[PDB]
Design an enzyme around this catalytic site. Structure first.
Site, PDB file in Angstrom:
ATOM      1  N   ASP A   9      20.827  80.283  90.003  1.00  0.00           N
ATOM      2  CA  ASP A   9      21.171  79.005  90.623  1.00  0.00           C
ATOM      3  C   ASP A   9      20.137  78.705  91.697  1.00  0.00           C
ATOM      4  O   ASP A   9      20.133  79.344  92.754  1.00  0.00           O
ATOM      5  CB  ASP A   9      22.582  79.043  91.217  1.00  0.00           C
ATOM      6  N   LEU A  10      19.268  77.735  91.433  1.00  0.00           N
ATOM      7  CA  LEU A  10      18.214  77.398  92.377  1.00  0.00           C
ATOM      8  C   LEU A  10      18.784  76.648  93.576  1.00  0.00           C
ATOM      9  O   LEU A  10      19.765  75.907  93.470  1.00  0.00           O
ATOM     10  CB  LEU A  10      17.146  76.553  91.692  1.00  0.00           C
ATOM     11  N   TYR A  14      15.916  69.619  93.721  1.00  0.00           N
ATOM     12  CA  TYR A  14      15.048  68.460  93.910  1.00  0.00           C
ATOM     13  C   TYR A  14      14.251  68.580  95.205  1.00  0.00           C
ATOM     14  O   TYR A  14      13.040  68.324  95.232  1.00  0.00           O
ATOM     15  CB  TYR A  14      15.876  67.173  93.909  1.00  0.00           C
ATOM     16  N   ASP A 101      19.279  72.953  87.218  1.00  0.00           N
ATOM     17  CA  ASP A 101      18.987  73.991  88.199  1.00  0.00           C
ATOM     18  C   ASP A 101      19.760  75.283  87.984  1.00  0.00           C
ATOM     19  O   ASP A 101      19.769  76.135  88.884  1.00  0.00           O
ATOM     20  CB  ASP A 101      19.265  73.472  89.616  1.00  0.00           C
ATOM     21  N   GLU A 102      20.389  75.468  86.826  1.00  0.00           N
ATOM     22  CA  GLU A 102      21.188  76.661  86.579  1.00  0.00           C
ATOM     23  C   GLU A 102      20.913  77.209  85.189  1.00  0.00           C
ATOM     24  O   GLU A 102      20.702  76.448  84.241  1.00  0.00           O
ATOM     25  CB  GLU A 102      22.685  76.365  86.724  1.00  0.00           C
TER      26      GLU A 102
HETATM   27  C1  LIG Z   1      27.844  69.363  91.898  1.00  0.00           C
HETATM   28  C2  LIG Z   1      26.858  68.370  91.337  1.00  0.00           C
HETATM   29  C3  LIG Z   1      25.489  68.608  91.400  1.00  0.00           C
HETATM   30  N1  LIG Z   1      24.640  67.706  90.900  1.00  0.00           N
HETATM   31  C4  LIG Z   1      23.203  67.966  90.963  1.00  0.00           C
HETATM   32  C5  LIG Z   1      22.386  66.783  91.491  1.00  0.00           C
HETATM   33  C6  LIG Z   1      21.579  67.281  92.703  1.00  0.00           C
HETATM   34  O1  LIG Z   1      20.189  67.055  92.537  1.00  0.00           O
HETATM   35  C7  LIG Z   1      21.882  68.778  92.810  1.00  0.00           C
HETATM   36  C8  LIG Z   1      22.272  69.214  94.209  1.00  0.00           C
HETATM   37  O2  LIG Z   1      23.034  70.417  94.123  1.00  0.00           O
HETATM   38  P1  LIG Z   1      22.324  71.845  94.356  1.00  0.00           P
HETATM   39  O3  LIG Z   1      20.980  71.693  95.021  1.00  0.00           O
HETATM   40  O4  LIG Z   1      22.179  72.575  93.042  1.00  0.00           O
HETATM   41  O5  LIG Z   1      23.344  72.640  95.309  1.00  0.00           O
HETATM   42  P2  LIG Z   1      22.785  73.471  96.570  1.00  0.00           P
HETATM   43  O6  LIG Z   1      21.809  72.645  97.370  1.00  0.00           O
HETATM   44  O7  LIG Z   1      23.938  73.925  97.430  1.00  0.00           O
HETATM   45  O8  LIG Z   1      22.042  74.726  95.894  1.00  0.00           O
HETATM   46  P3  LIG Z   1      22.755  75.555  94.711  1.00  0.00           P
HETATM   47  O9  LIG Z   1      22.434  74.895  93.390  1.00  0.00           O
HETATM   48  O10 LIG Z   1      22.236  76.979  94.691  1.00  0.00           O
HETATM   49  O11 LIG Z   1      24.251  75.546  94.923  1.00  0.00           O
HETATM   50  O12 LIG Z   1      22.940  69.068  91.868  1.00  0.00           O
HETATM   51  C9  LIG Z   1      25.117  66.525  90.290  1.00  0.00           C
HETATM   52  O13 LIG Z   1      24.308  65.700  89.816  1.00  0.00           O
HETATM   53  N2  LIG Z   1      26.426  66.259  90.207  1.00  0.00           N
HETATM   54  C10 LIG Z   1      27.329  67.116  90.695  1.00  0.00           C
HETATM   55  O14 LIG Z   1      28.551  66.858  90.615  1.00  0.00           O
HETATM   56 CA   LIG Z   2      23.395  74.172  91.535  1.00  0.00          CA
END
Ligand SMILES: Cc1cn([C@H]2C[C@H](O)[C@@H](COP(=O)(O)OP(=O)(O)OP(=O)(O)O)O2)c(=O)[nH]c1=O
Ligand SMILES: [Ca+2]
Ligand SMILES: Cc1cn([C@H]2C[C@H](O)[C@@H](COP(=O)(O)OP(=O)(O)OP(=O)(O)O)O2)c(=O)[nH]c1=O
Ligand SMILES: [Ca+2]
Ligand SMILES: [Ca+2]
Ligand SMILES: [Ca+2]
Lengths: 362, 362
Positions: A9-10, A14, A101-102
């Site tokens: 999980d990145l 973005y 990102d996963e």
């Molecule tokens: C939960 C969720 C995430 N996203 C996507 C879009 C965003 O670019 C991105 C932001 O979430 P992340 O960057 O993935 O969450 P985070 O910053 O806490 O890092 P991690 O992934 O390790 O938890 O996820 C959605 O589009 N819809 C959603 O409901």
């Molecule tokens: Ca994520």
DNA sequence: AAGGGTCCTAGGACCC
DNA sequence: AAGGGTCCTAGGACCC
């Protein structure tokens, strides 16, 4: 059948990509915005209350020093996403993409091979990489513990390869199935990894505060369950299987209840190349005339560069405007721009948003 | 891209299988009946007016000497169907099944290989096997004529192999696409074959008396077309493409209009093993209680012997009762009888006919 | 109609 | 929500 799965999980995907291309922003709170929402931000902004999918008006109130970058074009994010996936495919071929990102990777065969090469001497020297969930004590005579620790060494090797070869940080979660791996990957959330030993599986699922936090239980399921008085993970664990079948279905019932116990037999499915190519565009009813054609000409325009570069060709088209959609095959002579426009305009005439989708790739 | 396709069409398939197992009936008019209908009959009964899907009351009036055999169990027909398909797969691997008694085979590669082995001497000795549609004159310098005649030699070799190895008679139609091959296979209808040379393609399609006779135009399309004043093949040929797109859709429009000209680019698709296993059972509302369970226990009972013998296992189930249907995955421990019954009874409770279907094979 | 099969659409859930 | 993706259901056409 004791699997060793890892969930990668990145962090703020973005923001990571934008911070990379422009190092200048790496130091200030960054918010990637699409239309009127900060969809994600680097962790500096996280301290200042900047939150996922937060109005830019609100986001700027809490952090007036926020630097905003447009992320409506996902070309660079999508490219990096597949670079990450391919890197993990190098480790083990069976990699499952979840969003951009996963990734899930089945390390079972990989872990077994690494162990068949060891000897009793180093089997005791087998260490863990990263955190152990709930600070549980390791037992080097528990074979499942050893397999899971080797899985954590691999996860650490993946995370180092991503930063070294791609410059990305991220979290990793090692567990015995996809559900637990994904639930444990976030325990230590910024650029860290955690491994879940079996004895602590119940501690993990009960750490959840609502059944909606379980991957697999979305909005509809959560709000149904919430109508039967179910709310906590234990409420679902101890609920009558029998009622649950009637309300949601034998399928939904037996699966989510198993999830409530941390049980998940679903396999890590190789994602491979994508099954569809699409591009959207929202607006405040901006389109109400033939301008919509020019729009469709724009959505179309960019898509062709993508569906061509892939190598495979699409055999179906979808136009979308809850949404609605009309689709139709694609002629052969066409498969090899002007024709595609009108095709999509008769799909239009038959029928705030204008999304075009290429699917049925071969 | 000049294809040589053959359409194989067995004569009165069910009657052939019944006549084979019981030679006694081979001499009298045979009618295979399902419920209250003679679904098919041997050609002796054809002379006496016995017609496809004809009430047994009517069928016995026209032919009181009819011998009726039950064909509600398709186990033997289905087995012979795949024996025929496999025989044709021996000739060329790309064989497409249409129903139980029809097969398309792409002979293009096969015909080319047979010709690359010949020499100018025998190229003139290349003869036709079977009828030439409309008694058209052959031209041994027309390469397409030669390829089509070789295609007719192969078709005759297939038809002889089916009778020799399986004891079945049938028709064959050799043409340049699937539409024309299937339209020409029936010109000479009892145990005979016909080849279509390009010059006579228009004669063939215009031999049709209504657009409903074109494979690809069913009931809905025929009755729509019949609302725009279209009725003859030429009506569709000369109709405005533009209106036709609006009424049926760009897809349906451009395809069926091409069909009206004898043009059909669709490929012969390898069928392989089946994608689903199902078994039905109609009745005069006979089921209105839990007896339906015992019924479902019967449909289920036989199906298991089939889906097991296949080798692959199903991962989805459908219950059917215009019809309606509810479906759901199948547990893993289940995938390896009592559980399946109740599963299908909750699919029931959620909801004259009781059809069970196993799909999602792997 | 009988008993049995195709593949395609639209929309539905879910995920990020 | 943004922009972008999964796979699954029910029903719809079609074929014999
Ligand atoms: C939960 C969720 C995430 N996203 C996507 C879009 C965003 O670019 C991105 C932001 O979430 P992340 O960057 O993935 O969450 P985070 O910053 O806490 O890092 P991690 O992934 O390790 O938890 O996820 C959605 O589009 N819809 C959603 O409901
Ligand atoms: Ca994520
Ligand atoms: C046309 C049609 C055929 N069938 C199937 C069921 C019967 O067992 C079978 C009878 O038709 P056939 O025996 O195939 O027709 P036929 O006797 O004239 O010989 P040929 O195939 O060479 O034309 O076809 C249907 O089930 N539904 C249909 O609408
Ligand atoms: Ca994060
Ligand atoms: Ca037939
Ligand atoms: Ca016949």
């Amino acid at each position: 059948s004791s699997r060793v799965i890892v969930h990668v999980d990145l962090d703020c995907f973005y923001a990571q990509v934008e911070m990379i291309s422009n190092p200048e922003l790496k130091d200030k709170p960054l918010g990637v915005q699409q239309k009127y929402l900060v969809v994600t931000c680097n962790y500096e902004a996280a301290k200042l209350g900047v939150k996922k999918l937060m109005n830019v008006r609100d986001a700027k109130e809490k952090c007036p020093q926020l630097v905003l970058v447009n992320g409506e074009d996902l070309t660079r994010y999508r490219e990096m996403s597949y670079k990450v996936t391919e890197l993990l495919e190098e480790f083990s071929p069976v990699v499952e993409r979840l969003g951009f990102d996963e990734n899930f990777v089945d390390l079972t065969e990989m872990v077994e091979k690494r162990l068949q090469q060891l000897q009793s001497d180093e089997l005791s020297a087998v260490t863990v990489s990263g955190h152990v969930y709930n600070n549980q004590s390791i037992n080097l005579l528990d074979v499942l513990h050893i397999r899971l620790l080797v899985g954590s060494q691999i996860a650490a090797e993946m995370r180092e390869a991503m930063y070294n070869q791609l410059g990305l940080t991220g979290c990793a979660g090692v567990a015995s199935n996809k559900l637990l791996a994904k639930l444990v990957s976030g325990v230590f959330k910024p650029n860290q990894q955690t491994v879940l030993l079996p004895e602590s599986c119940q501690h993990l699922i009960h750490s959840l505060n609502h059944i909606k936090e379980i991957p697999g239980i979305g909005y509809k399921t959560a709000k149904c369950l919430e109508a039967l008085g179910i709310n906590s993970v234990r409420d679902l664990q101890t609920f009558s299987p029998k009622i649950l079948e009637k309300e949601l279905g034998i399928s939904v019932a037996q699966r989510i209840q198993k999830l409530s116990f941390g049980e998940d037999n679903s396999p890590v499915i190789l994602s491979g190349p994508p099954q569809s190519f699409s591009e959207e565009d929202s607006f405040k009813k901006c389109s109400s005339e033939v301008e919509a054609k020019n729009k469709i000409e724009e959505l179309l325009a960019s898509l062709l560069n993508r569906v061509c570069q892939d190598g495979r060709k699409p055999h179906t088209v979808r136009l979308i405007i809850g949404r609605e959609s009309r689709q139709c095959p694609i002629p052969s002579h066409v498969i090899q721009m002007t024709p595609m426009v009108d095709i999509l305009m008769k799909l239009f005439r038959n029928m705030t948003l204008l999304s075009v989708c290429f699917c049925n790739l071969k």
